[PDB]
Structure formats: structure tokens, C-alpha cells
Coordinates of C-alpha atoms in Angstrom, one line a residue:
Chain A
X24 CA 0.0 0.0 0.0
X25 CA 0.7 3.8 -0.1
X26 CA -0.2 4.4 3.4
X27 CA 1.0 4.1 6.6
X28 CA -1.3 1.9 9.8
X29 CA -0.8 2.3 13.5
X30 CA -1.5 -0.3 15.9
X31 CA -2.7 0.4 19.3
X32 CA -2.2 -2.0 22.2
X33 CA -4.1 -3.4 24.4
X34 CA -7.3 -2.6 23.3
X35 CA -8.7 -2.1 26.6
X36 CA -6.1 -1.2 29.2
X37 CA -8.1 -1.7 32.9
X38 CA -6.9 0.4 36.0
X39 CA -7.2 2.0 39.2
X40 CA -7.0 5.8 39.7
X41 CA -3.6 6.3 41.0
X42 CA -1.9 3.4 38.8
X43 CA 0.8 4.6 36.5
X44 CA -1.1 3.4 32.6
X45 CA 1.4 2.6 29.4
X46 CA -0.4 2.8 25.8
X47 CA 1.5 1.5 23.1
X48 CA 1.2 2.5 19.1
X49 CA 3.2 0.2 16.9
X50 CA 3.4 2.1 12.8
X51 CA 3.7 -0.1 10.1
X52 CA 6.5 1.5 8.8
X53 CA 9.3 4.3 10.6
X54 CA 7.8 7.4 11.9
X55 CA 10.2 9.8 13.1
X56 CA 9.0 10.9 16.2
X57 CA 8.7 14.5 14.9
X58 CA 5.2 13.4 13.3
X59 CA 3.7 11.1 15.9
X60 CA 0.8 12.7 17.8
X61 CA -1.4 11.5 20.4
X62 CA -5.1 12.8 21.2
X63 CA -7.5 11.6 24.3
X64 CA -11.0 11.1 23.7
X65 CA -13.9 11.8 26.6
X66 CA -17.1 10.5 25.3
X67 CA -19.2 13.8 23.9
X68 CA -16.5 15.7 23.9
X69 CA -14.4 16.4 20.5
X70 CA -10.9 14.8 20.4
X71 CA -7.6 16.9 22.6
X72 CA -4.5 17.0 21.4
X73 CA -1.8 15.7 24.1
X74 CA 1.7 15.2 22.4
X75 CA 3.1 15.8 19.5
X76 CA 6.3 16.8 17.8
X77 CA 9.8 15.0 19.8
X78 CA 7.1 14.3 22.7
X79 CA 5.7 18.1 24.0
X80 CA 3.0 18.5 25.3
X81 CA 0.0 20.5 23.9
X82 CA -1.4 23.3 25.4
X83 CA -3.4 22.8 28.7
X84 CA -2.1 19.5 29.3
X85 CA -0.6 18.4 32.8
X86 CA 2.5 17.0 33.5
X87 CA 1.6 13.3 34.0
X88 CA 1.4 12.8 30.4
X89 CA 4.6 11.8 28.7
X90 CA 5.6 10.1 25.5
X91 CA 8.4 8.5 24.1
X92 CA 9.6 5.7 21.2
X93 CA 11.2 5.9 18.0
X94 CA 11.5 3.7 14.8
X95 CA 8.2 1.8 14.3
X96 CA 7.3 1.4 18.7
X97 CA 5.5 4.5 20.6
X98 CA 4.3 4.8 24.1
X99 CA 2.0 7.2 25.9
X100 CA 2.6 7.4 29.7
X101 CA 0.1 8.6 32.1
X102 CA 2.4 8.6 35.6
X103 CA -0.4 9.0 38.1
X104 CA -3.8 8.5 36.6
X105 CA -6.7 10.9 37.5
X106 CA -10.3 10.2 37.5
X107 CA -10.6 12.6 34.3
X108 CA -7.8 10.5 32.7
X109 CA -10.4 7.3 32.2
X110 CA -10.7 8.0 28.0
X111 CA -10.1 6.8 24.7
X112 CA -6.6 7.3 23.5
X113 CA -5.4 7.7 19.8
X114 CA -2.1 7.9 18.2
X115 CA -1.8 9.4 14.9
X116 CA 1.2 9.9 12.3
X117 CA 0.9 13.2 11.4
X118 CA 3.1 15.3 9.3
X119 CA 5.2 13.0 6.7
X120 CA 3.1 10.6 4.5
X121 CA -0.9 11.5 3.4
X122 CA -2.9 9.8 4.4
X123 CA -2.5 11.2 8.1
X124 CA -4.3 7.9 9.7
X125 CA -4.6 7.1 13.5
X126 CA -4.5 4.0 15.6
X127 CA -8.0 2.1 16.7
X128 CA -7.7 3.4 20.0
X129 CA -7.0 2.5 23.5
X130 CA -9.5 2.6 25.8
X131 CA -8.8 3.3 29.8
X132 CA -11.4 1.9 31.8
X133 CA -11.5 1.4 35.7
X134 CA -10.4 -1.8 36.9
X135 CA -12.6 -3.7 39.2
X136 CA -13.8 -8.1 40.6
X137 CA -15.0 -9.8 37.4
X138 CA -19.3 -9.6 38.0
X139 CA -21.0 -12.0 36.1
X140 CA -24.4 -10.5 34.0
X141 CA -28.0 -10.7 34.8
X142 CA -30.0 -11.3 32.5
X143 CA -33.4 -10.8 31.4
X144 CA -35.0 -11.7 28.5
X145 CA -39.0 -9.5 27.1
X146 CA -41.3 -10.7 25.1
X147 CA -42.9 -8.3 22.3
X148 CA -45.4 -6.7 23.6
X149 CA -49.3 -7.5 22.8
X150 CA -49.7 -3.8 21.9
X151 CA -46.7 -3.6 19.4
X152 CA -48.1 -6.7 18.0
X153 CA -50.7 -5.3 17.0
X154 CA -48.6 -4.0 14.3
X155 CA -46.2 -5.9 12.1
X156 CA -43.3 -6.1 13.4
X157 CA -42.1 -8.2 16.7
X158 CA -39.0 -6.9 19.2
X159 CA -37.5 -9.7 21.2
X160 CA -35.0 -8.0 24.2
X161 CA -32.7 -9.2 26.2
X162 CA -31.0 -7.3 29.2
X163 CA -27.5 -7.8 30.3
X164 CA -27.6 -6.0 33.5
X165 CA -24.4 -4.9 35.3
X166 CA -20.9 -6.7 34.4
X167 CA -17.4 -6.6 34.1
X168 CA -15.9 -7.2 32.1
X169 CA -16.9 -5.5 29.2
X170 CA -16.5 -8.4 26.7
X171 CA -20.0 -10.4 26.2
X172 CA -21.1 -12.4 23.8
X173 CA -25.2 -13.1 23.2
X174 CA -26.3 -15.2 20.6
X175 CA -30.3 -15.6 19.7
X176 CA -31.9 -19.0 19.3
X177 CA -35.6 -19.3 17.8
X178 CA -36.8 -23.2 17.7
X179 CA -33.4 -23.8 19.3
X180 CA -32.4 -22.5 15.9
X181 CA -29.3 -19.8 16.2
X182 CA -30.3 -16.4 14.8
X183 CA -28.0 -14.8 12.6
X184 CA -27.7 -11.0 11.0
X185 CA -31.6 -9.8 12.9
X186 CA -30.5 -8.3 15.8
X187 CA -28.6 -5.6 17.3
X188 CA -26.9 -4.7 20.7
X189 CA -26.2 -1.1 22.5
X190 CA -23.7 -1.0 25.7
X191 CA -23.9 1.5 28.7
X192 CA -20.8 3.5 29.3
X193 CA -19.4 2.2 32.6
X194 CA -21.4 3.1 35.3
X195 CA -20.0 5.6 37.8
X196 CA -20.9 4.2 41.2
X197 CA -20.2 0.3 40.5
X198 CA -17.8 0.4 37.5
X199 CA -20.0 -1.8 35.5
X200 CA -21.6 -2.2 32.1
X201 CA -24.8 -3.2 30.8
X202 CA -25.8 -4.3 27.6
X203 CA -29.4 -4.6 25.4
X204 CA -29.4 -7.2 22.5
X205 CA -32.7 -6.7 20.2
X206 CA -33.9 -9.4 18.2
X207 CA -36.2 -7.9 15.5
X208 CA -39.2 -10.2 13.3
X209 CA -41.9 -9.7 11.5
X210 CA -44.8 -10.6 13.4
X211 CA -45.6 -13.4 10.8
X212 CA -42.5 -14.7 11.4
X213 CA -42.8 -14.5 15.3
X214 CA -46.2 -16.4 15.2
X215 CA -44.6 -19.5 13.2
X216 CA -41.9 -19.9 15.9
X217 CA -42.6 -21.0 19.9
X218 CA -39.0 -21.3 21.9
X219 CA -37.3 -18.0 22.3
X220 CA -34.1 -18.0 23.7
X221 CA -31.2 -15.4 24.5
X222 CA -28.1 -17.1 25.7
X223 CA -24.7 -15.5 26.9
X224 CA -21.3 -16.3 27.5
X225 CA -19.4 -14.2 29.9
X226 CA -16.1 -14.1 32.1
X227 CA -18.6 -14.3 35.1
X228 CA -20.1 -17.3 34.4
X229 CA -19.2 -20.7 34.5
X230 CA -21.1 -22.0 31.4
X231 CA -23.8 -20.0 29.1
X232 CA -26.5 -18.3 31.1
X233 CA -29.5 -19.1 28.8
X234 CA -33.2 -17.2 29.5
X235 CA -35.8 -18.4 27.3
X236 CA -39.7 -17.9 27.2
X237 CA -42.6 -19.8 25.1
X238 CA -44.8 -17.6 22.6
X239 CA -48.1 -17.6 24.5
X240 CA -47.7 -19.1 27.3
Chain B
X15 CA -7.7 31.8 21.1
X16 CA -8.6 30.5 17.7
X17 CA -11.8 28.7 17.5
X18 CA -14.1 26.7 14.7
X19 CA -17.4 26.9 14.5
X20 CA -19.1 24.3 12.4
X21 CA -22.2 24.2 10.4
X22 CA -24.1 22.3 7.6
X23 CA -26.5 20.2 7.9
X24 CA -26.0 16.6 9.5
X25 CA -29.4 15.1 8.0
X26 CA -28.8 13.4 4.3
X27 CA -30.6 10.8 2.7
X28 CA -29.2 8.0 1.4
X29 CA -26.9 8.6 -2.1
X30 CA -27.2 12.2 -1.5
X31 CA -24.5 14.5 -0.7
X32 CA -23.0 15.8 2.8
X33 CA -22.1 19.5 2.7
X34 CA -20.7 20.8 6.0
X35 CA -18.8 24.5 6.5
X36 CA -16.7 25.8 9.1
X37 CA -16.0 28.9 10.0
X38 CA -12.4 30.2 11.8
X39 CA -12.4 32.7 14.7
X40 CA -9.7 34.7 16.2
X41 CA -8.2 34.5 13.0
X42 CA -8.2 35.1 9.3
X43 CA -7.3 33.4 6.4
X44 CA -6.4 35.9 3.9
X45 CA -3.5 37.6 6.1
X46 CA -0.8 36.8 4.2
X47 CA 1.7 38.8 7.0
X48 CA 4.0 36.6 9.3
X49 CA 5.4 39.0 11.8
X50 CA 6.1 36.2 14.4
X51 CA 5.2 32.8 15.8
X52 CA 4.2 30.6 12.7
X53 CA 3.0 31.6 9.7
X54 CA -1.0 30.7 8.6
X55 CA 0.1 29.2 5.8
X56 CA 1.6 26.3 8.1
X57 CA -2.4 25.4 8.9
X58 CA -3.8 23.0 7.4
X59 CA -7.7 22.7 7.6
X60 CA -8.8 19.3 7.8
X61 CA -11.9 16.9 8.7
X62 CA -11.8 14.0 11.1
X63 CA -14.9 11.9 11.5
X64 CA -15.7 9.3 14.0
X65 CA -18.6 6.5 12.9
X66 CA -20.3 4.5 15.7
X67 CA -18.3 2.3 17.4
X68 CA -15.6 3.2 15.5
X69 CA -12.4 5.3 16.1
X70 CA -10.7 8.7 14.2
X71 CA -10.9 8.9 10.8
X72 CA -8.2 11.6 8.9
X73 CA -11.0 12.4 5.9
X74 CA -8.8 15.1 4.2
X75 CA -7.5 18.6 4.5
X76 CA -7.1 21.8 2.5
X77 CA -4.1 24.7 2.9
X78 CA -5.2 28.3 1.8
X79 CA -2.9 27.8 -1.4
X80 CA -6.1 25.5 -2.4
X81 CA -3.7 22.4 -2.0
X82 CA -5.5 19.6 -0.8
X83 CA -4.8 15.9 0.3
X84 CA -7.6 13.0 0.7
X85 CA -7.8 9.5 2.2
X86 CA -7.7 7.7 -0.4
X87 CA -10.9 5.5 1.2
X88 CA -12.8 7.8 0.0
X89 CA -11.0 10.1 -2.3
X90 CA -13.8 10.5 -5.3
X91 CA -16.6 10.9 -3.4
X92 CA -15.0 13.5 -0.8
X93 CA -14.3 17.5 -1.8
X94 CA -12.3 19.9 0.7
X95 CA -12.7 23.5 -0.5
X96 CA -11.7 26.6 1.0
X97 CA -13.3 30.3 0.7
X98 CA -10.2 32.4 1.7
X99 CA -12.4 35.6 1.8
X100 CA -15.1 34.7 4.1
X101 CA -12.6 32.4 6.5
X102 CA -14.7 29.6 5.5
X103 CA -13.6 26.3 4.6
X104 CA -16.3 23.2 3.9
X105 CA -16.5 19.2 3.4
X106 CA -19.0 17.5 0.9
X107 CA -19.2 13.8 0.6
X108 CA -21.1 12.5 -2.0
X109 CA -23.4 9.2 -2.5
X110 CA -23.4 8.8 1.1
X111 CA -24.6 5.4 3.1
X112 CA -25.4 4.5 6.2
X113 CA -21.6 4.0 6.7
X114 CA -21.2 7.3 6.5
X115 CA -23.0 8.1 9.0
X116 CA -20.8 9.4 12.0
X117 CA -19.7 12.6 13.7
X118 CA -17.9 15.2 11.9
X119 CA -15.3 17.3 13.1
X120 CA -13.3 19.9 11.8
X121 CA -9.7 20.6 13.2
X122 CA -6.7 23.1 12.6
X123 CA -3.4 21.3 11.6
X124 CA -0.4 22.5 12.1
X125 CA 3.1 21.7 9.8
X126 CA 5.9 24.1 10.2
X127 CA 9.7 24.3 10.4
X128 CA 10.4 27.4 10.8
X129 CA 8.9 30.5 13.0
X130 CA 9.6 33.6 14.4
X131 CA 10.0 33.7 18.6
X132 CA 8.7 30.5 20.4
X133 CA 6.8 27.8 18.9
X134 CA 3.2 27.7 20.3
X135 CA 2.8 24.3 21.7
X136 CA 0.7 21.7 19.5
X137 CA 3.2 21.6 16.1
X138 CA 2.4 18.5 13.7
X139 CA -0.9 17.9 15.0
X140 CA -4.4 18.9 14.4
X141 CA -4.4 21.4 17.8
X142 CA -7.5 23.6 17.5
X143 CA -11.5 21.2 16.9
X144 CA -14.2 21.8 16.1
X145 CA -17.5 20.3 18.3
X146 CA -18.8 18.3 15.6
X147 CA -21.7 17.9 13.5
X148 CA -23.6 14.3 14.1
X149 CA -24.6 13.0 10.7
X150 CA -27.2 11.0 10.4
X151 CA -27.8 9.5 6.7
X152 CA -31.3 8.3 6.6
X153 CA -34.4 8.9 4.4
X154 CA -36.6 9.7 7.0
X155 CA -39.3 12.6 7.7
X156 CA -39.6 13.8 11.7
X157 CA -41.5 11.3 13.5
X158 CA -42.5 10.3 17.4
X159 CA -41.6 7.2 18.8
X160 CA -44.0 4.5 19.9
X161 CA -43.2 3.4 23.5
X162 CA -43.7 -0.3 24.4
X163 CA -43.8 -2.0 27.6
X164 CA -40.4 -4.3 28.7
X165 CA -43.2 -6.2 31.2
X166 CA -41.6 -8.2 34.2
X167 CA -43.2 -11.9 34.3
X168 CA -43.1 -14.7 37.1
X169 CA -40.9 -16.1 35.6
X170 CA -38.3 -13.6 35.0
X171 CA -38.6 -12.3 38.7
X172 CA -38.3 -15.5 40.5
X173 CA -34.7 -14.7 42.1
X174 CA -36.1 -11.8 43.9
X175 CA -35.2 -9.0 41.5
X176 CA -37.3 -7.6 38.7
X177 CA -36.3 -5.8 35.6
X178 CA -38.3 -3.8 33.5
X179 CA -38.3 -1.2 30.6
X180 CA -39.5 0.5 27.6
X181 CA -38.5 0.0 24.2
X182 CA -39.0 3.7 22.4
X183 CA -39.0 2.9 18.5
X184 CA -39.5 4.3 15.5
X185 CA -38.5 7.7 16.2
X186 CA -37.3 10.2 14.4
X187 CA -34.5 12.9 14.3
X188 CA -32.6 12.1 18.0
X189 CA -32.6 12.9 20.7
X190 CA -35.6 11.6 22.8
X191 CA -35.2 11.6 26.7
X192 CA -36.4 9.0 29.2
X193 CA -37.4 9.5 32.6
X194 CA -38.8 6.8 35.3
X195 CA -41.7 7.9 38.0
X196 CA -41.1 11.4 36.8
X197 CA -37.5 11.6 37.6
X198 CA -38.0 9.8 41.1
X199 CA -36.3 6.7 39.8
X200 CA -33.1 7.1 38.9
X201 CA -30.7 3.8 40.7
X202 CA -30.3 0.9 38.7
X203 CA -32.0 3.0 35.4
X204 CA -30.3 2.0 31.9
X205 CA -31.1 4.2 28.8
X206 CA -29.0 2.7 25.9
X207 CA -27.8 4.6 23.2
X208 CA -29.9 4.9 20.5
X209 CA -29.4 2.6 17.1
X210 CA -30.4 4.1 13.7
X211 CA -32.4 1.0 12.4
X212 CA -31.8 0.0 8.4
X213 CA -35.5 1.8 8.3
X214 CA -33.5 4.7 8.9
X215 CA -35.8 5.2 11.9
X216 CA -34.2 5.2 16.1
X217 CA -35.1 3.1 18.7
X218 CA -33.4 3.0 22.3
X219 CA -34.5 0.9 25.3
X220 CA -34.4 1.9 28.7
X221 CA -34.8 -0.5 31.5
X222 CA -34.4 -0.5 35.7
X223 CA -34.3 -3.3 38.0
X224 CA -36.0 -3.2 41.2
X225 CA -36.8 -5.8 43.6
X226 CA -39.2 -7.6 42.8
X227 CA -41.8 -7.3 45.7
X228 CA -41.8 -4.1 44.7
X229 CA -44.0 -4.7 41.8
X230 CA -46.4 -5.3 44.3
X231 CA -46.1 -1.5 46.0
X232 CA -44.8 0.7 43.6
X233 CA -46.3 1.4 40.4
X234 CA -43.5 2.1 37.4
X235 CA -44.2 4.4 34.6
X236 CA -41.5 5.9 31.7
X237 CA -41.8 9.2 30.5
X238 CA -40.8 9.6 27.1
X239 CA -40.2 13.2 25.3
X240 CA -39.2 13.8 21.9
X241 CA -39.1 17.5 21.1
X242 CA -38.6 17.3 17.1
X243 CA -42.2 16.0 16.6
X244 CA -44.0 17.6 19.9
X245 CA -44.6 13.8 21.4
X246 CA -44.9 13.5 25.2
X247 CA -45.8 9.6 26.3
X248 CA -46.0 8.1 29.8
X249 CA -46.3 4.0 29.6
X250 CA -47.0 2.3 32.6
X251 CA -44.9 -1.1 32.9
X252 CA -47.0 -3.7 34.8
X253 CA -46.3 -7.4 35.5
X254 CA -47.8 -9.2 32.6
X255 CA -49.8 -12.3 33.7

């Protein structure tokens, strides 16, 4: 290709306010560190600048940040971390080869016991019903990690490409997520079937967590 | 401090094109003196965007020569232009999908090597945003959601906690808000973001957990506002025998 691709590792780095946090950028091809910048990322709020050019910092931006690396290998330092510091992280090469890409991003989340989902599964309702379409939900209610995986069965029949999922940020006062998977039918089709089943796989729990309900009964 | 203020519309349908502007504050483009610190024509005016559950995207920039450089993801269905004059410069992406849709940010970038006095901080970056324009690319006309009940059932509250919701869909343009007992209830309330459906309509649940003998003694209603369209619901959530 005629571009150059950043790496960003881990993909979620987990931590406690106080704890020194290391986010690493690896280019696909030497970057002199003149053109390697690094932005946060606060949810609603448009990206910051934090380092760029040799490592200085940007404008309004504290101490505890640092940055270092050279060749194709970059890190971003946060010494102490602050409870504002809990972000999105992106490197970027910036300055010597169009296009100007960045990495995927690092997120910093805070670090707490693994807590096992949950779960709750709806049926559609009689009054949506009455019109043609059918919403099956299931509620993942308060875990850690973030990582989940839900799969729908219909008729013990696994569902593929008709549903959709939405996550929580992480709560504030117990530092956990939640997560809604919607599995959307026509009503037709939700009339043929009986056995609906949401079923998820998490750190928390030993073996699939399955919640099911009967059409009707 | 220089600032952008951005503008355009975020709402296109489907194959039609994108046009967003910004405008730059506490500057101008057409001063062509450099009497110290870096020269404008070291800024570089650029668009970023960030798609759902996605990360930064570099879309393109433009310099005030009328130079410009495109990711070549895109490049021919993006134009940068710039109107030197009215310190203007704008983005428009054409034949748009629903891939497109994302926020859009405009951002200063900064290249130099040589300047007069100190360097400002922020050198070979983009140093000075924008607050972004939300695009949404979606056929649709304004339109109020239907609420539905997320009804808790015997069997669902048999380990002594309950969960219940309501699913707000079919909606359109964001935002709607969701209340519980008329703000009363707000511990252990979830309102997940919103998903732009392939119908190009929204839809969000929003769900609490409560224990579950407290179906018996508390009645639980969601209050559902969506300005755009003047629609005001309250749905009460009951047990569903």
C-alpha cells in the first residue's frame, strides 16, 4: 500500500485511579518521532491533542502525560492517573506521508472483581403486535468485564444478522456495564416460531446463562 | 484563542451528498503577514470523523494555497474546499450510506519548520477542533416514537429481583429523553444509546431493576419526550400475567 497503519495495544487497558497506565502504538512503517501525535477522547467531547512533535506536550495539558519511542514502537505514559484521565486514547502519524491515519484506539477503563451478568430476556409486547413487526429484548444488567457475547436461538435454531446490541458507558458508582441485544421479526415470522431463547457467555459465568420464554404461554 | 465553529446540515438521505462548513475565529485566512510565531500558511484545515463504534478517521485537509490531500478511502466521493475571503472552509461527501454516518469534526493542523520567537505548543498535529456535526444518513421525515412495555413476568422475577423497561421505537431525528416515575427513579436505570435502524428510523431501550416485591407496592411508569415532533408519552410497565 501507499499508506502508513498504527496499531494500538491493548485494546482495553483496565486500572485504578492512581496506577501509572502505558499505551502503546506500533506504525507499520518508521515514523520519526517528529510526526507522531497523540489525542484523548472523553465521550461527547471532541478529540484533545496531548503530544506531539519530539514528545511536547500541547497546550493545557498536565504533567503526568509523557511520551516517548522511536522507529516503528511509541508509548504514551500517564504517571499517576486521574479520574478525568479514564478515556479513549489515539495515536496518529501526522506530518510526513498523506494519508494522516490514526490507531484504533485504547481505551482506559477502571479496573474492578469480574461480576458476572444478569440477565433478562422480554417478550414483544401485545400492543406492538398489534402491528407488524415483533421486538425480542434481552437485558445484560451490570458486568465486568466488558467483553460479552449473546447469541439468539428461535426453535433452538441460532439467529444470525436480525438483531442488534447497544452497551452502557461504565457506570459511575459500581464500575460496571450493561448491555441490550434486540432481536427484530416480523410478526408473521414471530407467530410461526414457539422457543425464544437469548443465551450468553461471559467471564462471570461458568457455562452460558440461557433465559428463554414460550410464545403464549 | 482561535476557534471553529461548524455548520451544515447533518441530516442526508441515502446517495445524496454531505455539505458541512466551518467557519475560523480569532483568525483570518487571507492575512498573508507573518510577523512572528508561525505563519497561517503552516495550517492546514482538515476533517476528522468518528462512525459508531468506531475510532478517528483523517478524511482530508485543504491549505489556503487550495492544496488539498484526501484518504484515499474515499477520495472521489470526498471534496475539501476553501473560501479564503469569508474564512470559511467546507467538506462534501457524496453518494453517502449509512456508513457514513458518524460525527464530523473539523480541526486546525499544524506543519511548520520554521517561526519567528517561540513555537506555540501543538506543532504537527491537528491542535484547535471543532465540536462536531452528528450526521445522520437516513431517508426519513420527523417522526415520534412508539413506546412499548419491557413487562416483568413470574418467571423472570423468581430470584427476587425484577427488571423492567421501555422500548421507544421508531422515532425520528434524536434525541428523545427517558425518565422513570417522573424523575423519582433514577438507581439501577439504563437508557442505551440509540441505534439508527436499516429503516432509517431510532429506537433505544431503557430498562431498571428493582426488587421484585416491589412490583407489588410501587407502580412504574417511563416518561418519554421527543421535542422534534412535539410527542410526550407516559407508559406504565406492569407485571404481565
Amino acid at each position: 500500500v501507499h499508506e502508513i497503519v498504527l496499531t494500538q495495544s491493548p485494546g482495553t487497558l483496565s486500572l485504578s485511579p492512581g496506577e501509572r497506565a502505558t499505551l502503546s502504538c506500533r506504525a507499520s512503517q518508521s515514523v520519526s518521532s517528529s510526526y507522531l501525535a497523540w489525542y484523548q477522547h472523553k465521550p461527547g467531547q471532541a478529540p484533545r491533542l496531548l503530544i506531539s512533535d519530539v514528545y511536547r506536550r500541547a497546550t493545557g495539558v498536565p504533567d503526568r502525560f509523557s511520551a516517548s519511542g522511536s522507529g516503528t514502537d511509541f508509548t504514551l505514559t500517564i504517571s499517576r492517573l486521574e479520574p478525568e484521565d479514564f478515556a479513549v486514547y489515539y495515536c496518529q502519524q501526522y506530518g510526513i506521508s498523506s494519508p494522516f491515519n490514526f490507531g484504533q484506539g485504547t481505551k482506559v477503563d477502571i479496573k474492578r472483581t469480574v461480576a458476572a451478568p444478569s440477565v433478562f430476556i422480554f417478550p414483544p409486547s401485545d400492543e406492538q403486535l398489534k402491528s407488524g413487526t415483533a421486538s425480542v429484548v434481552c437485558l445484560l444488567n451490570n458486568f465486568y468485564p466488558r467483553e460479552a457475547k449473546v447469541q439468539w436461538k428461535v426453535d433452538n435454531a441460532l439467529q444470525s444478522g436480525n438483531s442488534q446490541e447497544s452497551v452502557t458507558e461504565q457506570d459511575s458508582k459500581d464500575s460496571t456495564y450493561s448491555l441490550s441485544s434486540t432481536l427484530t421479526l416480523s410478526k408473521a415470522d414471530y407467530e410461526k416460531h414457539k422457543v425464544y431463547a437469548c443465551e450468553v457467555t461471559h467471564q462471570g459465568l461458568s457455562s452460558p446463562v440461557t433465559k428463554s420464554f414460550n410464545r403464549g404461554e | 484563542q482561535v476557534q471553529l465553529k461548524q455548520w451544515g446540515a447533518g441530516l442526508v438521505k441515502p446517495s445524496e451528498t454531505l455539505s458541512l462548513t466551518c467557519t475560523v475565529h480569532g483568525d483570518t485566512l487571507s492575512d498573508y503577514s507573518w510577523n512572528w510565531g508561525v505563519s497561517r500558511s503552516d495550517y492546514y484545515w482538515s476533517w476528522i470523523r468518528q462512525p459508531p463504534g468506531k475510532g478517528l478517521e483523517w478524511i482530508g485537509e485543504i491549505n489556503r494555497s487550495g492544496s488539498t490531500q484526501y484518504h484515499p478511502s474515499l477520495k472521489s466521493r470526498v471534496k475539501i474546499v476553501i473560501e479564503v475571503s469569508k474564512n470559511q472552509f467546507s467538506l462534501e461527501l457524496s453518494s453517502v450510506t449509512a456508513a457514513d454516518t458518524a460525527v464530523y469534526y473539523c480541526a486546525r493542523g499544524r506543519r511548520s519548520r520554521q517561526w519567528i520567537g517561540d513555537l506555540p505548543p501543538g506543532n504537527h498535529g491537528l491542535d484547535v477542533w471543532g465540536q462536531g456535526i452528528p450526521v445522520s444518513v437516513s431517508s426519513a421525515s420527523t417522526k415520534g416514537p412508539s413506546v412499548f412495555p419491557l413487562a416483568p413476568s413470574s418467571k423472570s422475577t423468581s430470584g427476587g429481583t425484577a427488571a423492567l423497561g421501555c422500548l421507544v421505537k421508531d422515532y425520528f431525528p434524536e434525541p428523545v429523553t427517558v425518565s422513570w416515575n417522573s424523575g423519582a427513579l433514577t438507581s439501577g436505570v439504563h437508557t442505551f444509546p440509540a441505534v439508527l435502524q436499516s429503516s432509517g428510523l431510532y429506537s433505544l431501550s431503557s430498562v431498571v431493576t428493582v426488587p421484585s416485591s416491589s412490583l407489588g407496592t410501587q407502580t412504574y411508569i417511563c416518561n418519554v419526550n421527543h421535542k422534534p415532533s412535539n410527542t410526550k408519552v407516559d407508559k406504565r410497565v406492569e407485571p404481565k400475567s
